[PDB]
What does this fold into?
Amino acid sequence: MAKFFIDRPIFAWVISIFIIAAGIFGIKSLPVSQYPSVAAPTITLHAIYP
Amino acid sequence: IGIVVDDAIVVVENVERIMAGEGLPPKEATKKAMGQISGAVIGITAVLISVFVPLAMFSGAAGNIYKQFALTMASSIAFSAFLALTLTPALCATMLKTIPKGHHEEKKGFFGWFNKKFDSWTHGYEGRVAKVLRKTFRMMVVYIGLAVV
Amino acid sequence: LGSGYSLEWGGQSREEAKGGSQTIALYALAAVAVFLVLAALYESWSIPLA
Amino acid sequence: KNAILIIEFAKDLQAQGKSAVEAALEAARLRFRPIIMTSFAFILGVVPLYIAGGASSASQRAIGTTVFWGMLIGTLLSVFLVPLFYVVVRKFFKE
Ligand SMILES: CCCCCCCCCCCCCCCCCCCC(=O)O[C@H](COC(=O)CCCCCCCCCCCCCC)COP(=O)(O)OCCN
It folds into this structure.
């Protein structure tokens, strides 16, 4: 693997550029927040009996 | 940030040492370096990833935080290892000019001072290690005490 | 018209105001991808232009 | 990682006519410098968190203290203790 790429710098550069582009695209579509979602769901039932 | 440069540092240091101590053209000095240290990279990467693998296997708020930390750490480390294997050799063989004979030597100012200090530190460290190995019993009790503390 | 009178779109009009066109944006990506692939295959930055 | 960097090289080197002590000493001598480089790069990188301040600095300081001191002390102790571990383990669990 290491001997294959020692003779082909341009192919390695191409792979690196593809990785960079993928990273930028991923950054462009990531929501921001303070902390991850850690709260569990809850359901409340309301009743009235005057 | 400080962990993704370990493999590249290892590779570059090995190739630089070979070039400086053997006077070798970069293209095959790189191949020799890759042959020598092709297993250390994989060992280091496996060791690093095996500890962050279990963090992503818990539930709750703590589990969520652990997953968020561990997945990012592991993905970055894996990409760093792949890049060190793939791209580092190419640049080190093509974009790195030949080292002039003794170019690293004859440094003056801060660099020469630092080189002397580091040589002295290495000599002292080797002298201490060679000694700590003739007492394999007392040092074990010292280690046990350290662990207990 | 004074305040108290607004405007809304319907049917086909909704998406036009919701955005324009982005066909040119994607056409450029398909060229960069082809250039990168051809550069990797040829092992040279200059030939893929032909 | 720091321990394996020496253990693997010593294991490879002893397999060819090298005693345990000789292999351990040679491995330590050859692997010293990269270990220091890789450890202190991390230490200097994490220093910014150690002295954090401003908005949301409590968590930064909390993580920085532990990581910084653990790395420093662990590296300083390991660089001197790992060869002993290799020698003792090889001597007791023969083969
Ligand atoms: C000559 C050589 C002879 C070889 C020796 C002979 C063969 C002996 C083989 C013995 C095999 C070990 C038997 C251990 C029983 C398994 C213990 C429970 C495992 C379990 O519940 O799942 C784990 C729970 O961790 C979680 O994430 C959930 C939280 C609970 C974790 C607390 C459990 C304590 C774990 C301490 C270590 C236990 C062993 C773990 C390997 C996650 O693991 P998994 O279910 O996903 O399985 C990995 C599949 N890829």
Remarks:
- The two ends of chain A are 78 Å apart (CA to CA).
- Residues 16 and 22 of chain A are 10 Å apart (CA to CA).
- Chain A touches chain B at residues 1-3, 5-6, 8-9, 12-13, 15-16, 19, 35-39 (CB under 8 Å).
- The pocket of phosphatidylethanolamine is lined by residues B 57-58 (CB under 6 Å).
